[PDB]
Design a binder for these strands. Structure first.
Ligand code: MN
Ligand code: MN
Ligand code: MN
Ligand code: MN
Ligand code: MN
Ligand code: MN
Ligand code: MN
Ligand code: MN
Ligand code: MN
Ligand code: MN
Lengths: 93, 98, 93, 105, 93, 106, 99, 80
DNA sequence: ATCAATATCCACCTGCAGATTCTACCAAAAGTGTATTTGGAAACTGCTCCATCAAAAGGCATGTTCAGCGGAATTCCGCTGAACATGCCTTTTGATGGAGCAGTTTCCAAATACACTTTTGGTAGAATCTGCAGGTGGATATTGAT
DNA sequence: ATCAATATCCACCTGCAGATTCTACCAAAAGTGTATTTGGAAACTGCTCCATCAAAAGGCATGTTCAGCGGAATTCCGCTGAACATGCCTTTTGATGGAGCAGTTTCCAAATACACTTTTGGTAGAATCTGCAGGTGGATATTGAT
């Protein structure tokens, strides 16, 4: 019966960037769409990227090319750094 | 009595409606139109109210954006009055009709 | 009670496109930055809008029938729109 | 016990993102790094739009971000605008803009 | 070196339609493109139909709804007929 | 031993279409009829293009179908032209078409 | 008394002519350099398959030809027969390539 | 010359001709070179990303075909 | 409107690039048997959507008056098409090393698959909280009128 | 140029639904820890086919010349849409009840996923085969001036 959303996360991120700002449910719904949409575009691009290369595994490497194929320049540059960083940090665990 | 010159209230309206987000088509009429069209594809169908809302939000954003294109077309011909030939040209290049 | 009939009738729907009024059409044009409108624009907008709705609704109902459901849901519309390249944020999709 | 997002130093849920990749049949297998990376990208872009939106809210002297703030944010930023060029934000409105030729003397 | 294609089948089919007709190298390449493209669109649409309905199987029901969302008016009706024919025939065997 | 393609009465690869489906990551499982149905539809669409392409070949006094004949067949057909609306057929040219306003005084 | 075809008559001739054929219209080599040049700005020391460069030319010319059709409708819309930079611009604007 | 300049007025005019254009403003030519440049920069940027991801050094027709698909400019008859 | 200057169309022959057919391999599909799982059916439920009803005011329709828009028409400069003489360079073979894309075998790290301990995200919710929606009006522009 | 008619923005204040805070239940999830299978990089070398210099050579890009006529500006006025005011229709709002439908739970079996060994349909390179590109030129046809 129970459904999901990135709501709690979007809220955590909202507070880091604007601590005194809130978000209406409608605005949060839109935010939830955005994440799901970007999630699909990226996963889909990664999925076919892997297929083209006869790979059966989607790795952070595929996510990265996908992000580069998908995002507009300046956005790609930053997202790729935040992603390379996260993975690297992750590994040191 | 007072009379604003033709074009003045028009520009005021443009500033007014570009400053807001309210849907511009009456709800109920819009709704009947949806059930009417839908009834013609499949009979006995009910709608979640958000379903009608989504259609109205998608329909209005589509028409508003189509009016922008249409407007560029009229301005292209040195007119300020949009016409069916302007809508026709915009849809042709968008690849909707062609 | 579950006998002769069809369980009461809701009035026949006809000519509803005429509900999209001249004033409404002008309001949308205003938001689109239009200052002057030829008299013939109204019927043309109605026809354009009718083709637009037929297209989306036709797809929505297709997902609806597919789920063996009798209620067109917001998700059905959302997928319909995505399908036509008119992604909508804020309704679950 | 340590959430897999916390060692990645992320707010977005790496586990969740990891299951969605599975549940979606994007590939036979999903490497351990993939969900960490994708969740960092999602978190990034959402922080990016929350930043721009919060500013638009603050300009209208509002405390809570509504859809028109998200719309103002996206349409005023070239990149986000292109990223969402075929997307419609419900209740967002359009950018105030009037062609010069239509203006008075 | 082994490289699959639908060329032979395209060619068998060609003969069933224009027995005394041939096809250039390039044209046959185009036809192969076509079959792959259409295959992808139908599979993919079918793939999300199954996901929207929280279904783990892609049956001919999905292929059918897919064909309906994808093919223009008359093209869809005919395709659906052929599709149904073969399945019916395939079971009667 | 019998080709699934023959039991279905098809020229198209019911078996490979089935394998292309498993391997494409479209869903966990692939039902029995799916590949049959899809094969059937791919054959149908091919027969349709070849038929029109063919006639296009004849009309130009030729007997073998070249890309141009595929183009004339597709762009001349309302429905196919829509299905292939955002597809470019290599070496196909364009349909003869001059805006009447461009024609000389008559 | 030399013979002169009227302005526009040779133009319509080139139209029927080129709308009949399917051969490329940009000299192949000049095109090869433009492609190599461009790719270079992305990754140096690159090699291209033959068909690769051919695919790009087919794509490029199909794109331009179609844009010209749209550009022509925009000129005609403004009651002209000469296509101009702004006609190309209005077409790309309405298609979504600009902004 | 900048290579782009290798795309001549006669070639352009020819394309325009197949496009059914009858007259042509002199500036169209430059405007067309810019448009073409932007087109090729887009497809090739994507094609190369595919090559680069494939840990390759050659751009194949499939990289181009995939880039074009990716750009909604699907091309037939070069694989795919 | 008759030549007259020119470009496009159309007939016949013939040999080769490119299509079709033939010739055995083998990756892949088909056949049989065991194992695992999905999703329609039946039966009870519970939210949601449909259809009223009643009141009232927001917004649609209609009719009048005229401002000014857009298009018809006349004018005329100079931009672009047709033609042509000059020569630069793209195109056609095609033959020749080697950067590279691939095919083959080996195999560690990385990714299942499954049973278990443990936390976190979602939902209901009474509580309280509190941003801001909705309604009024003068000060400040800016006309439209005279 | 002076003066009255007016729209919008920003401030004024309480009215309450929509957002935020616990309170806490509590499972579907995520994390942890084994046993286990495997995708894909790594070292390796063959058959591609990509870069390239030779370079004859005519097809095609280019610079200049002459004027045809297209675009752009200007002038004008019919009449179409903008502004507004009056009448009143119908959408909007908010509370209410009824049923048909959707969604959750349990179950039986038809259907699909393996796992493995047997049987060819499809592919590649070679041998056989032919459709149509091309060359020549009067015939047909369309264009332009006197
Ligand atoms: Mn009806
Ligand atoms: Mn005017
Ligand atoms: Mn080497
Ligand atoms: Mn919690
Ligand atoms: Mn307010
Ligand atoms: Mn392996
Ligand atoms: Mn003129
Ligand atoms: Mn009335
Ligand atoms: Mn055999
Ligand atoms: Mn010939």
């Amino acid at each position: 019966t129970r459904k999901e959303s990135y709501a709690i996360y979007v809220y955590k991120v909202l507070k880091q960037v604007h601590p005194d700002t809130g978000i209406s449910s409608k605005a949060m719904s839109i935010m939830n769409s955005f994440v799901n949409d970007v999630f699909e575009r990226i996963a889909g691009e990664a999925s076919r990227l892997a297929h083209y290369n006869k790979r059966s595994t989607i790795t952070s490497r595929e996510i990265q090319t996908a992000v580069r194929l998908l995002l507009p320049g300046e956005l790609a540059k930053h997202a790729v750094s935040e992603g390379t960083k996260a993975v690297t940090k992750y590994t040191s665990a | 009595p007072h009379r604003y010159r033709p074009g003045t209230v028009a520009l005021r309206e443009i500033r007014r409606y570009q400053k807001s987000t309210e849907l511009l088509i009456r709800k109920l009429p819009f709704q009947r139109l949806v059930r009417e069209i839908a009834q013609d594809f499949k009979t006995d169908l009910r709608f979640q109210s958000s379903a009608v809302m989504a259609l109205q939000e998608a329909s209005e954003a589509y028409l508003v954006a189509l009016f922008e294109d249409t407007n560029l077309c009229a301005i292209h011909a040195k007119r300020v009055t949009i016409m069916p030939k302007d809508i026709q040209l915009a849809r042709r290049i968008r690849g909707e009709r062609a | 009670l579950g006998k002769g009939g069809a369980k009461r009738h809701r009035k026949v729907l006809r000519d509803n496109i005429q509900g999209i009024t001249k004033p409404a059409i002008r309001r949308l044009a205003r938001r689109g930055g239009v200052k002057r409108i030829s008299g013939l624009i109204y019927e043309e907008t109605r026809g354009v809008l009718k083709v637009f709705l037929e297209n989306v609704i036709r797809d929505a109902v297709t997902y609806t029938e597919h789920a063996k459901r009798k209620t067109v849901t917001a998700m059905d519309v959302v997928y319909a729109l995505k399908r036509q390249g008119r992604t909508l944020y804020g309704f679950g999709g | 016990a340590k959430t897999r997002s916390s060692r990645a130093g992320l707010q977005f849920p790496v586990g969740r993102v990891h299951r969605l990749l599975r549940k979606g049949n994007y590939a036979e297998r999903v490497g351990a790094g993939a969900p960490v990376y994708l969740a960092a990208v999602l978190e990034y872009l959402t922080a990016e739009i929350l930043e721009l939106a919060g500013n638009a809210a603050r300009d209208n002297k509002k405390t809570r971000i509504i859809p028109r703030h998200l719309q103002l944010a996206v349409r005023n930023d070239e990149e986000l605008n292109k990223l969402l060029g075929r997307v419609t934000i419900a209740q967002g409105g359009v950018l105030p803009n009037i062609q010069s030729v239509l203006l008075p003397k």
